[PDB]
């Protein structure tokens, strides 16, 4: 099927740059125009950039028109973002999105959307997160149900990346959205709830991922 | 006052004509602007000719839009060439006398012709 | 640019209920050619890319269920869910795409339903935290409805001010239940200076506040 992968996020000093890539798989990529959309909490969702199919049309955003620079290489099957002068308004979600074909004919919208490539622009520098065990105990039992998790402290920027048994465990878990600490850093915690049956068998290791301080962390977490 | 007309809806790189229409107390000799104003944003002046024909451009239309005038009806032309999409908006005519507008919309849809 | 403004900018219904929201445009999105309305709608799950629901301003994307509904002309445009589902929390965004790309702010639709207890654990700083001269507690508030709820830490029964941040989860998905965490920060030196932590927790649902508690170092 079609996939999109963006990728290239990161922290970047304001006045700095930055180039995103958009990886294209499941389609003919040549044959079909491309675009970046950004996101951000008090942004909305907004249009970045147009590219069609054989680069002879582009378009950009008005508030990036200057500073960004979309670009393809149709053999590579990869998709370009080049930002430069970066500012804090910048600070958002970038998601490359395809364009079908003949929307003029067929009105079809930028329907396949990658997960995203998330960038942070600020002078303050990186902190990988601590990861400490949330372990289950008779203080986080209830009626056969016991509560377990990772507690994700001190990361500077956001995101932090939270899966369970490399993605194998989903269910009942709750990674809550981070908190800012006065220090400057953020925190959180994801959590999960299981048979107080399983504790002695079963094996529950949260995975942290942190790419701006390229922090990768796996931690076992015992009763 | 003063009456535009030519504004219509064209795929990119499309022509359009507006004409704005004066009546009354406008002279020729004050001369002639056409601006342009999309939502949320100030107007702009798009072009503008003087009494003694002397002609000026926006930066953003310098090559692709032109003024000319018919003094003996004191109708005043903006010939509007390779049309982009940020050209979509409401041009009015001013002499100051403002007018009703005419809308310019510029779209940017693919075909397979 | 051709702008889109949505509302309201958010609205809670309970399952079953129907829905509408709505889209303005500043100018007519309808394209001359062929009398086609150039309109979409983008469904935003919690943690998810837009996904997309509708075209042509009426027309169903493909695999898309039957209870959404697109509507309009002129500058005027609605979605409508006719049977809403708890799945269907999420923040629906209008598109133009006839001049140009821009988007509505989007339109947050959340889930009403009956009111549901936490259950209420508590966890002590690990060994690992407390090496580093930190003090973290844990007290987690799981899959209650609705949002309110007061948390109180106390400390050797005293009543703690200024020490904690509380975060809460977006809805769920399948239950439309939140969950809550407050974490109380002391250093190491200041929580080996008292003995008994509890989390007090006040919800709709409790016929009484509940306590979850422990004796540092057991």
């Known amino acids: 099927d079609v996939q999109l992968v963006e990728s290239g996020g990161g922290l970047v000093q304001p006045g700095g740059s930055r180039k995103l890539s958009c990886a294209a798989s499941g389609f003919t990529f040549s044959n079909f125009g491309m675009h970046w959309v950004r996101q951000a909490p008090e942004m909305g969702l907004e249009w970045v950039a147009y590219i069609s199919s054989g680069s002879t049309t582009i378009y950009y955003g008005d508030t990036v028109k200057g500073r960004f620079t979309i670009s393809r290489d149709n053999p590579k099957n990869t998709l370009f973002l080049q930002m430069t002068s970066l500012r804090s308004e910048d600070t958002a979600m970038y998601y490359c999105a395809r364009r079908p074909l003949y929307d003029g004919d067929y009105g079809y919208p930028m329907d396949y959307w990658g997960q995203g490539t998330s960038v942070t622009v600020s002078s303050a520098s990186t902190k990988g997160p601590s990861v400490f065990p949330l372990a289950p105990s008779s203080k986080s039992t209830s009626g056969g149900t016991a509560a377990l998790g990772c507690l994700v402290k001190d990361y500077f920027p956001e995101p932090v990346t939270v899966s369970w048994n490399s993605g194998a465990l989903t269910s009942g878990v709750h990674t809550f959205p981070a908190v800012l600490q006065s220090s400057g850093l953020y925190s959180l915690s994801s959590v999960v709830t299981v048979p107080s049956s399983s504790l002695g068998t079963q094996t529950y290791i949260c995975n942290v991922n942190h790419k701006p301080s390229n922090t990768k962390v796996d931690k076992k977490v015992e009763p | 006052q003063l009456v535009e007309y030519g504004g219509g809806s064209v795929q990119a790189g499309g022509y359009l004509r507006l004409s704005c229409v004066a009546s009354?107390?406008?002279?020729?000799?004050?001369?002639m602007g056409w601006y342009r104003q999309a939502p949320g944003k100030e107007r702009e002046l798009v072009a503008s000719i003087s009494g003694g024909s002397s002609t000026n451009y926006a930066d953003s239309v310098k090559g692709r839009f032109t003024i000319s005038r018919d003094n003996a009806k004191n109708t005043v032309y903006l010939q509007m060439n390779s049309l982009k999409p940020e050209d979509t908006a409401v041009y009015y005519c001013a002499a100051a006398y403002w007018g009703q507008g005419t809308q310019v919309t510029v779209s940017s849809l693919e075909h397979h012709h | 640019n051709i702008m889109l403004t949505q509302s309201p900018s958010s609205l809670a219904v309970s399952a079953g209920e129907r829905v509408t929201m709505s889209c303005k445009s500043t100018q007519s999105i309808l394209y001359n050619s062929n009398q086609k309305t150039y309109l979409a709608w983008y469904q935003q799950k919690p943690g998810q890319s837009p996904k997309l629901l509708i075209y042509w301003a009426s027309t169903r994307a493909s695999g898309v269920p039957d209870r959404f509904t697109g509507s309009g002309s002129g500058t005027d445009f609605t979605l409508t869910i006719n049977s809403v589902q708890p799945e269907d929390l999420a923040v629906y965004y209008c598109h133009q795409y006839l001049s140009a790309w821009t988007f509505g702010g989007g339109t947050k639709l959340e889930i009403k339903r009956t009111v549901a207890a936490p259950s209420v654990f508590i966890f002590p700083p690990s060994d690992e935290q407390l090496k580093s001269g930190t003090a973290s507690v844990v007290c987690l508030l799981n899959n209650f409805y609705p949002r309110e709820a007061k948390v109180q830490w106390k400390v050797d029964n005293a009543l703690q001010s200024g020490n904690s941040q509380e975060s809460v989860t977006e809805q769920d998905s399948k239950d439309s239940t939140y969950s809550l965490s407050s974490t109380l920060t002391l250093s190491k030196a200041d929580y080996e200076k008292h003995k008994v932590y509890a989390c007090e927790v006040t919800h709709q649902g409790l016929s009484s506040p509940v306590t979850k508690s422990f004796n540092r170092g057991e």
């Open positions: 009354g107390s406008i002279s020729l000799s004050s001369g």
